[PDB]
Symmetry: C5
Subunit: 376 residues, 5 copies
């Protein structure tokens, strides 16, 4: 993920202009090959027209160029790009939100699956490892970068996500369908066993674990569904064909004609279509947004960092349920125990934020008349 | 479902261009008949104008062609297609998400409906079979492909989803309305019976089953509502009439006139309207996206694979509640038991992802001054 | 509801074209009067110009027609129609989803309110009748078709939804506000009484009933809010005025002038504006979509079938809680008891769906090198 | 709220046209001053050009008018209005849905907080009064109309929402932030006290009360957030400046020039720009939709009726928890006790809805062949 | 946050016009530098053309200006701005809703974590301080203004959010990932300890605390995800390049040419492009909306007031759980105890709202015939 949230904290003078000097995740990186190809075809026809074609041939070419410039309908392309890329971006953010995290589960497991002894550690660590394992299986199913990390189940077993015994159980399942759900059913069964052994002290806590498991499993399944159910291929081919039709019309119709011939609208020869190359860069970048975001679990630059999230989720979950279980600092009175009001100090940098009026509501400046304040 | 998620993992040079060489689920497959019809009418008028019509008749035709080219308003068509097809695509994804799956139920039933004996197997397998049966009834109601698979309730009984006794109970219901809800009320009653027999060990687990059943039943009902409440037929007729009005204006106005007559904008005769055929292909494909997605449970190529999902859901649910019930590998210490930090190994392919700075937040590079860090 | 989901299962050659031959729910039915009025004004001005107006008068008219054709800005109308009708369609689908159904409640009541005796039947049937009665009161408040069915509370009492005693209690409430919520408070009280008498066996089941009641009551209230809070009348008047301004500009500017006068763009006289009538039909149909969907509980053809839903909901709910309570077929082993895998047979029609590769994930065809598979 | 849901039940011939004859909540009411101002500037320049400016001055003015007509870009204005007003309308409906209602709470309190005696009445009535008081405090914070009704906390105390003792407790809180949340914490504490005294008979019912309280409090807080976090002022200034730029270009460029001068496109002098005034009325009404809906808690005509909702919510909640507590009609057999099927009678007006085929699903008309029905 | 909700309560004559006179949060403040730069380049080329360029050079420049005016395609820019800025505004409101507040937690903790003694105060105050501390850690991670307030964890410790002991525990965690989740796991553990000590009186109340904690923690994590997963940098660069391409075409093509040369469309020389500067101001302000809203936790004027929310949330939460715990005014009969109906008095200002008909539903004015009211 190319994060530039810091560069755009404040609407500054440079603002988005400075973002034009970034290379990773950029439009330049995604589009320079297509821009050179577009420019190569344009200068190939330019060289043909200037040096190769004869006078009759040049006249015919100019008639074709005037004809093709008519069909460079940028409004249809802008419409269909707008709608398609809006769909793809929304789907992209939905896919990011559908990635499983153990955060709700780790809060619930640290709060509900009890025991300072090795068994309690085993239960808590095993419940999160199941959650992490379900996440890893679905990600290696849907992510190229996680597949290259875990090309085999042996790789998942060596990485500590799955034990050898769990690998035997997992392979011995006679299922021809993706088994990402298997750790989730193991999690259900183990949470039931924990509640039967009294490690979960109450039936509502078991219900809370199973609710949070169901949310987690839902996210893993949603990843699977987004992977399988692509943005319809007809819809994609339609937008690609739209853009390419526009660029063929721009590749022929934006050819600079001889000012000698005195064609209307063709009286200046810049030899390079600056504005047509910028339109190409704009529209092709707009489609490259969809191209990058259509499968966000590839290995792009704005593609999701699925291997970083796997490592973070594992380490954090294990901290939360093993090192931070029942490891509270002693309840001691906070700084504002004796103070009726409560306000942390402000730094010299942000002290200016003080003395700005505290918002109470829009209606607290009306200043009615005395007569209008009396009830009926 | 034509899944091309792998082909678009990374925004590559080929990118969407290579997707133009796919046939299944493609714009070519959905639109070649309409393209040949469009082209047939265009060349029928072309042949009429070139060989059949007389000189007066040819002049009149050219006046009509110039008149019709005025009315080829592509911006209204792009607007209404954009809005209608956006509606249809959103509805299509909603319908996919409203398809019932037993995944939440199987986690809950493996976790809550207990017993290693044949009765416990019966209860768990029967609860999921009820869920699968409710799904099959609604799908054969809404899916053409599942109806051809299950043309009669006898077919559902032979497929193992409904017993003969359950068929007698199901037919003996005096209801003239679709009975997809019947297995869900059977599921409610059986979960109640399981909780009364103590197979469900706690009242919260029964509540969890009924919550998950209600979600499942909601999905089945939602499938029914999407099937019944079509995208309004007036709205569809409006977009079809829009597109056909544009194509009639393009079918007459894009006719190539004699350059001899010296009509403005008509001075080149290509004999085939490359750009008009591409516009037709673009706009008709855009409407074909809605046509394919308007009922996603047909038997298209991007239509949902409802028979695959039926088979997967059945097999997986039965595995989850029968073979994987209380079948945990023994709790043993994972690979990272003694390690304070936790990190799976990375392959040579994805080791490059390492040594990239771990994201902490946008604000961790501000580097304030010493004086501005002091509290007031 | 005009359901055409079957006609559009597959993207066929005819496809949406055949939908142009439907009359119910159609654009023709909704728009033929307005089309004849538009055409009547157009031919009234045509007859005035051709036979009534003098030569000076004809010249002035032609100057006015050329002036008015300038103002036929179809892009603003397409924008505002797009946005307004998108709002109205989204609101329409939201209103359909906000119609109350007893399906969650009937699953919960069959599962939670117990007793084979007449009292248990009374409790279950009375809880659903309360839910159905709340639905009927709000629908007769918001639906014209249900109001014509239930013009008085006496009509609701005769229909079996409300008893005479319940009518006395319902009228004796000193409330000047719509009392659709009254059965919901009766449902709350009766569920409490059932739980006190032990008919609901656990406090979590009572909580489940009250949760499902709250969802039901929320839907009824949402119907009330959608009825009361119309799409803002300023926004509607704006789109109606937009469309009518465009049609006045098209009614004057699309008048066919004498080719004799040799006006530019006016050199052919078709005597009937085919393309202008199609634009009128397109844009007026687009607004007629909003007109039909703005109050979906009227008595149109795409308006919701609220009387069918009332009858279905009542019959089904009563079946679910009375005839199907504790009426399970005996738990017997299903067809796939002894089979490790589970797969229903496929028909000759849909056997082709088999032998298509089972989807596992996008990443299962990468085929890495041996060296890149090794961990660091 | 100007409710016209009845007038638009059916898509009638008059339809939206008759809505153009409404004054309250109308575009006329919101825009006649701006229309007269626009028209006053237009006729001021018209009078200047016709009677005041000299021949040279008139020529210069006409050059300026032709120049300004070029810049009347209606497509950008339509784009930005569309997007901004769509944002404002969505926000408006969200704000309406975020208004607190006690309906879920009253169902839960009538069902959970028990006692026929004065103490039970006190507890139920006090819990709803707290909810109503939280609603009144946030509304007087965000609503102008409720602020004019409750200009002081003394006004809330006189209205019966807050007792004098509760006023002392409420003022004695050392908080400089809006205290709308205070009754919600009182509600939490009182529900806890009720559950401790056994007035709430079970811990799940207390959980249900607190869940419903949290939803209520969330709605009150959401009202506060929508009040505080305005639609960004830069975004508003952008759309206002867009519209005013268009209207300045239309105010100069739509000036009728002398047909004598023989300017192209300026050959008819209507002395009043009918179509330009309609465009002004259309676009300014479109922005007036946002202007009316941007703060829906003002005192407009489409602004929310917050004082009606306060009175309804109070009266209804008090009925629900005080007069209708444990006040059921005796469980007696309904009209359809002995009938296997269940169907209320239909009136002569709506009997036509009968005999229309009952919808079962799209797939129930396929009519397969005998050979295709056989399983593999 | 620049709140102008009061200024736009009613759609007044001034309305949005008066909002053009605001400076904070305004388009003027965000855009005057860019406007002066645009104007500086425009007048630099104007001075070059008028005084510096020779006659041949002036002719060439005018040919370039006519060429560049062709490429000033405002419709593509309006499309892509519309879609991108709509995305950014929606994301901005989502980010505001994803900011954590303790309001649900404070209601639940005041209602569930009991004890008037110092230990109960410690538990309640410590649970909210954990919630506030989790909020402060994530905000200092994502907010520049909170980072300048809390540049170090020492600053958080001095502000009273974290104790020294909690700081030792927090630093001793071997995690390389952002530790905003740490107080949430402390909250889970402490709520478990409270429930074990009997301070939480029931298991459902513990479940309610953990549910509300999970919502809170979800909001904190969502803040982290929005911070990390920027709006794709390719999409931003595309819109910035679009706007800058349009402004370069407007910077050259909107240059005023000599009326002497008699170029079409260039016959008036205003020396300052009023309308082009307004278009620049409109489009650049439209992009400045995204620029301001793209990271709403900066230190702008419409950026969120994160330091005010930190102070409010802390003070209010501590009031709610410490000063207002079990501090109810004595249950006494409200003003409407003996009144069957319930209605607060109305002021002279808002008494006009009375006598307006109380809304009952759209269907209560149909006035059917006697014969049509009879059941079949
Ligand atoms: N390995 C990452 C690459 C993404 C990036 O570099 O931002 C993935 O799975 O997508
Ligand atoms: N039988 C599948 C066909 C879909 C496909 O082939 O993708 C269905 O029900 O839609
Ligand atoms: N009586 C139905 C009519 C709808 C229809 O015929 O589809 C209603 O209430 O809307
Ligand atoms: N007093 C109402 C006025 C709204 C109306 O009249 O519709 C309010 O608070 O907005
Ligand atoms: N300090 C505030 C500044 C916002 C404002 O001034 O409105 C922040 O964190 O964004
Ligand atoms: Ca990608
Ligand atoms: Ca289809
Ligand atoms: Ca209607
Ligand atoms: Ca308002
Ligand atoms: Ca910002
Ligand atoms: Cl619960």
């Amino acid at each position: 993920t190319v994060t530039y949230t810091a560069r755009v904290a404040n609407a500054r003078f440079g603002g988005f202009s400075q973002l034009l000097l970034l290379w990773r995740g950029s439009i330049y990186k995604l589009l320079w090959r297509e821009l050179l190809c577009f420019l190569g075809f344009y200068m190939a026809l330019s060289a043909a027209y200037r040096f190769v074609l004869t006078e009759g041939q040049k006249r015919y070419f100019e008639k074709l160029v005037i004809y093709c410039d008519q069909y460079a309908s940028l409004i249809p392309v802008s419409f269909v790009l707008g709608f398609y890329v809006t769909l793809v971006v929304n789907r992209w953010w939905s896919q990011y939100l559908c990635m499983p995290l153990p955060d709700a589960l780790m809060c619930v497991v640290a709060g509900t699956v009890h025991g300072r002894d090795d068994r309690g550690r085993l239960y808590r660590r095993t419940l999160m490892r199941y959650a992490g394992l379900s996440a890893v299986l679905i990600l290696r199913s849907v992510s190229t970068a996680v597949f290259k990390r875990f090309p085999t189940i042996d790789h998942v077993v060596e990485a500590g996500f799955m034990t050898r015994e769990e690998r035997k159980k997992f392979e011995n399942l006679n299922s021809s369908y993706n088994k990402y759900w298997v750790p989730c059913v193991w999690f259900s069964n183990l949470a039931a066993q924990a509640r039967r052994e009294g490690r979960i002290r109450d039936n509502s806590a078991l219900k809370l674990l199973l609710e949070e498991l169901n949310v987690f499993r839902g996210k893993c399944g949603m990843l699977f569904h987004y992977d399988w159910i692509s943005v319809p291929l007809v819809y994609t081919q339609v937008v690609t064909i739209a853009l390419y039709s526009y660029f063929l019309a721009c590749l022929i119709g934006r050819q600079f004609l001889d000012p000698a011939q005195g064609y209307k609208d063709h009286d200046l020869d810049l030899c390079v279509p600056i504005f047509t190359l910028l339109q190409f860069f704009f529209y092709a970048g707009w489609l490259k947004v969809a191209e990058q975001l259509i499968n966000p679990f590839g290995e792009d630059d704005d593609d999701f960092e699925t291997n970083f999230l796997i490592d973070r989720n594992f380490q954090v979950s294990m901290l939360a349920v093993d090192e931070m279980y029942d490891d509270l600092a002693v309840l001691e009175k906070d700084l504002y125990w004796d103070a009726a009001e409560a306000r942390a100090p402000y730094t010299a940098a942000t002290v200016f934020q003080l003395r700005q009026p505290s918002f109470q509501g829009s209606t607290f400046d009306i200043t009615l008349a005395k007569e209008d304040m009396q009830f009926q």
